[PDB]
């Protein structure tokens, strides 16, 4: 009942199409270093997210394991 504060998210990101197609390809690439990916449809575009934490620690580990694995990752921090 009611715990761990809520204030933001750190996950990274690898990019956005608005072809979910590629948007899968790409998450498949993360998945490849054993990332967690996801796909998000937003309106007019589809994202490309792999590796979410309440850390940002953890965003900056996937992401540059994802530059150094052979994709663009980034960490957003998302309230």
Excluded: H, M, P, W
Excluded at 4 to 11: A, Q, R, V
Excluded at 22 to 27: C, F, K, T
Excluded at 42 to 61: E, M, R
């Amino acid at each position: 009942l009611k715990k761990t504060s809520s204030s933001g998210l750190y996950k990274v990101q690898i990019g956005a199409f608005k072809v979910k197609a590629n948007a899968d390809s790409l998450a498949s690439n993360a998945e490849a270093k054993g990332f967690d990916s996801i796909v998000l449809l937003k309106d007019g575009l589809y994202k490309v997210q792999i590796g979410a934490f309440s850390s940002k620690d953890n965003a900056d580990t996937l992401a540059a394991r994802a530059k150094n694995a052979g994709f663009d990752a980034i960490v957003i921090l998302e309230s």
